Amino acid sequence: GSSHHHHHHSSGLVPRGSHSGHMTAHTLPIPDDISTINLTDPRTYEVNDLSEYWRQLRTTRPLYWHPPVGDAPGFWVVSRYADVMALYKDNKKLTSEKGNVLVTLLAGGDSAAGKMLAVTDGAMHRGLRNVLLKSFSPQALKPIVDQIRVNTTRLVVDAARRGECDFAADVAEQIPLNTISDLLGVPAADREFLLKLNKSALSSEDQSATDAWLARNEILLYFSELVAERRAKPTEDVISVLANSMVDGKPLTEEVIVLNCYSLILGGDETSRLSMIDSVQTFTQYPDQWELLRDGKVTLESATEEVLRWATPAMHFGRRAVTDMELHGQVIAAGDVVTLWNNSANRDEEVFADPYAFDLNRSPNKHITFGYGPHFCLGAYLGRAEVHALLDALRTYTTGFEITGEPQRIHSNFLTGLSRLPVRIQPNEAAIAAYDSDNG
Numbered sequence: 001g002s003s004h005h006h007h008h009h010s011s012g013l014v015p016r017g018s019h020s021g022h023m024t025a026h027t028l029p030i031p032d033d034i035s036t037i038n039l040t041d042p043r044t045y046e047v048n049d050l051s052e053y054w055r056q057l058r059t060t061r062p063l064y065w066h067p068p069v070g071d072a073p074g075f076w077v078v079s080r081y082a083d084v085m086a087l088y089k090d091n092k093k094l095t096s097e098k099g100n101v102l103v104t105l106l107a108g109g110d111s112a113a114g115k116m117l118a119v120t121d122g123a124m125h126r127g128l129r130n131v132l133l134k135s136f137s138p139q140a141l142k143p144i145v146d147q148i149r150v151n152t153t154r155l156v157v158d159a160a161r162r163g164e165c166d167f168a169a170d171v172a173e174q175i176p177l178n179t180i181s182d183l184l185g186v187p188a189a190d191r192e193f194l195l196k197l198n199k200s201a202l203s204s205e206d207q208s209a210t211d212a213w214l215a216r217n218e219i220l221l222y223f224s225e226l227v228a229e230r231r232a233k234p235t236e237d238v239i240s241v242l243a244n245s246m247v248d249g250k251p252l253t254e255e256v257i258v259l260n261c262y263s264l265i266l267g268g269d270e271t272s273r274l275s276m277i278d279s280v281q282t283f284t285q286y287p288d289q290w291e292l293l294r295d296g297k298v299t300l301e302s303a304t305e306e307v308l309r310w311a312t313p314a315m316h317f318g319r320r321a322v323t324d325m326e327l328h329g330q331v332i333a334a335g336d337v338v339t340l341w342n343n344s345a346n347r348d349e350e351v352f353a354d355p356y357a358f359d360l361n362r363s364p365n366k367h368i369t370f371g372y373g374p375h376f377c378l379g380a381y382l383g384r385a386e387v388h389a390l391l392d393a394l395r396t397y398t399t400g401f402e403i404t405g406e407p408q409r410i411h412s413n414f415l416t417g418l419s420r421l422p423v424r425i426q427p428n429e430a431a432i433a434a435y436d437s438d439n440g
């Protein structure tokens with residue numbers, strides 16, 4: 001006996017980690033019936049490959065009436081890119097002011113409506129976007145972007161030296177939220193205070209109902225204290241700009257300014273994470289594309305847009321109809337909730353030649369992973385920068401990587417992607433040495 005092996009028979013597989021997975025990926029059934037799929041529950045995005053579902057809708061039922069599920073009601077499903085683009089543009093005949101996602105739209109409202117940017121229309125929206133325009137311009141964001149790049153490169157290099165890591169928790173969770181609170185102007189000491197306070201605010205399972213409300217309350221109260229320091233000292237950060245500006249003739253109320261600050265920490269976080277996690281997974285699925293990125297045969301800018309188009313973390317956003325509309329001969333009445341499906345739109349063969357090919361040098365690439373029109377993502381440039389920085393770090397300091405355990409999906413009828421991605425990273429060893437002589 002020189003080298004030893006395990007002894008098994010028809011069983012004997014021990015759990016390695018907290019999961020009990022055996023496969024890198026799973027073949028999901030491709031459904032054919034339209035009525036067999038319920039879009040309300042998250043599970044139907046994890047058990048199904050909706051590729052054929054979405055094209056059946058995109059060719060025969062562009063404006064499809066989804067049936068009522070459990071408690072009322074049914075809703076309109078919009079699949080085609082041109083249709084989705086057109087409805088995003090209309091903030092007059094449609095509104096976000098009664099919610100912009102399935103949960104809020106089907107429940108019949110958003111509690112922050114008329115105050116929070118995403119759920120506000122008319123003059124109030126126009127004014128809120130204008131005061132924040134300069135704060136989100138490339139020029140003002142350049143120091144932020146530069147810091148994102150430093151952080152991402154450090155997190156990737158450490159993950160590369162480590163070799164064995166869970167990409168979600170060790171890299172992806174560690175960029176977006178710290179970026180946005182930096183932009184908001186919270187001190188570094190107060191960051192961990194915000195993180196643990198938000199985690200329970202967004203907890204579900206299982207007097208825990210109000211525990212989440214109090215957690216949210218405390219964040220809002222803390223921001224209100226940072227707001228108070230508007231008069232004390234303006235600081236160029238978003239909190240300061242919002243507290244010291246006025247729209248249109250009147251100053252913004254404590255609740256509004258503070259509620260939008262919180263909307264920034266909600267929106268600046270998960271959706272970027274999901275994109276970053278998705279890119280890494282997709283590179284292991286399409287090695288030639290990864291090779292193309294690593295060997296510098298495609299620009300980071302172009303590659304970034306393809307990763308965004310591929311991931312499409314926010315599967316849908318929705319509106320409610322104020323006045324009656326007529327699309328494709330069919331009637332959309334007042335009160336009806338419409339859902340615009342970005343993930344189907346970024347797979348439309350009408351706009352994207354060979355839609356299910358992951359192509360880093362794809363052009364044109366006019367996706368709608370961010371919105372379109374008035375509600376077009378405020379932090380699109382940030383989302384881009386965070387992906388851009390990851391891609392740049394990856395091609396500089398790694399030669400390749402591989403999925404190491406069964407990845408874990410997030411459960412949402414609205415967002416998609418992974419919460420856990422075990423990877424083995426193969427580091428560019430000589431590149432790290434160059435990073436170590438300069439830094440440290």
Ligand code: HEM
Pocket residue numbers: 088096100117118119129180263264265267268269271272275308312313314317318368369370371372374375376377378379380382383384
């Ligand atoms: C790649 C990641 C991201 C994706 C896929 C994404 C996607 C979107 C989409 C599709 C919308 C339109 C929603 C609607 O029309 O109702 C939107 C809006 C918005 N997003 Fe993002 N976003 C991302 C990153 C960010 C970041 C980093 C921030 C920074 C806080 C952010 C903050 C916002 C805000 C404040 C709005 C509301 C815009 C308005 O009401 O005018 N998002 N996002």
